[PDB]
Design a protein around this ligand. Structure first.
Ligand SMILES: *[C@@H]1O[C@H](CO)[C@@H](O[C@@H]2O[C@H](CO)[C@@H](O)[C@H](O)[C@H]2NC(C)=O)[C@H](O)[C@H]1NC(C)=O
Lengths: 114, 195, 112
């Protein structure tokens, strides 16, 4: 019932790669999907992380584990990334949230030095 | 009819401490839920007994809007079957819960530099809170064997405890405003409908 | 639907304490949530008081009463203080969406 997103902070020089992880802890409920959002440093609106050459989104469904990997880091990627997990319809279970219920991760502040 | 006044609950200038949580009845209005659901301002949007994607197609005999302030580490407790200091002593959802739990980070509003200690929560109670019950009393909790004549001291604690909300806190100790909508469907004409 | 604030005017010196008491009356609901507002002496607005440090609030639910005690009085404490009892709770018959304020307490702390 909690999205544990790690790391909370990361700083890397321009060129290398990084990976953001967020997993659901202590859950018996089906998950439908998970989206990734980025709020650039200085903005207040989030952008959906769509298809990208340098973006890789990985899902381990049975693990309730979701990861985002960004290769060839640039300063344009500096900001805060959040994962947004969506719940599926877990049949015959009162304690599970309905289909479409969501929870955001705590967030990840990433800094890329030029 | 007219739209339900969700704003006067979500956008209230001041929120209450979880032990004195607020409750406003929503009645005789059209309820637009996808405005809340399709938003980027809410950290948690979990509905129970009903999918949020179907809320605008359903009517209800009565809708209650409950609002309070807790810390992020305790948002998990606002859910059916959960236990903890808040669920047991402050705000308890029933196991047969049908409704939605909506929460968002309110660090910019409810945190002061040097700490905001104005939001309280009940730390001690004799028995666990019944579902949707609210406890207002401030009587000294009889902790140990020796009774208490309204005096705070040894084995005599004040039942309420303050949060320390500071901007420099981790997200687990940052303040979260929570709105829980509880839906009731009886064999009677429904008062709240979606479009 | 109105709280009575006492006293109306008290004066102290630097150092000592003071206590403003407030009782909620003419209502069927309990005393749920409260606030204390302060208007500085030569000021035009009221500031929300932060509880838990110098400002100590005692709340008694049985007597529908609540008080504020202030210590370490400095000359900057001169002003007016007001209570505020408010709640938004609704049940089958008992309803209370009230937001009431006190008559005020003009305090005057003297210099060293
Ligand atoms: C609470 O207030 C917010 C902001 O005042 C409302 O959402 C905004 O609505 C205006 C009007 O279109 C837009 O300019 C903003 O972009 C909206 N912001 C968001 C985050 O949606 C919100 O509707 C109010 N709450 C309720 C329940 O109505």
């Amino acid at each position: 019932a909690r999205v544990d997103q790690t790391p909370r902070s990361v700083t890397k020089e321009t060129g290398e790669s990084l990976t953001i992880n967020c997993v659901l802890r202590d859950s018996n409920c089906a998950l439908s999907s998970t989206h990734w959002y980025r709020k650039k440093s200085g903005s207040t609106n989030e952008e959906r992380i769509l298809q990208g050459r340098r973006y890789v989104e990985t899902v381990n469904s049975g693990s309730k584990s979701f990861s985002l990997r960004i290769n060839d880091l640039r300063v344009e990627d500096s900001g805060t990334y959040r994962c947004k997990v969506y719940w599926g319809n877990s049949w015959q279970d009162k304690f599970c949230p309905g289909l479409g219920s969501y929870e955001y991760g705590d967030g990840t502040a990433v800094t890329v030095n030029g | 009819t007219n739209l339900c006044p969700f704003g006067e609950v979500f956008n209230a200038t001041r929120f209450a401490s979880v032990y004195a949580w607020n409750r406003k009845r929503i009645s005789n209005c059209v309820a637009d839920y996808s405005v809340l659901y399709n938003s980027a301002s809410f950290s948690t949007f979990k509905c129970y007994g009903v999918s949020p994607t179907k809320l605008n197609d359903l009517c209800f005999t009565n809708v209650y809007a409950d609002s309070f302030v807790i810390r992020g580490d305790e948002v998990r407790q606002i859910a059916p079957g959960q236990t903890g200091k808040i669920a047991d002593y402050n705000y308890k959802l029933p196991d047969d819960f049908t409704g939605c739990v909506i929460a968002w980070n309110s660090n910019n509003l409810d945190s002061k530099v040097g700490g905001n200690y104005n939001y309280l929560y009940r730390l001690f109670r004799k028995s666990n809170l019944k579902p949707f019950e609210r406890d207002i009393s401030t009587e000294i909790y009889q902790a140990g064997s020796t009774p208490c004549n309204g005096v705070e001291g040894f084995n005599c604690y004040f039942p309420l405890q303050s949060y320390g909300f500071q901007p420099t806190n981790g997200v687990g100790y940052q303040p979260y405003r929570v709105v829980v909508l509880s839906f009731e469907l009886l064999h009677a004409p429904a008062t709240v409908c979606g479009p």
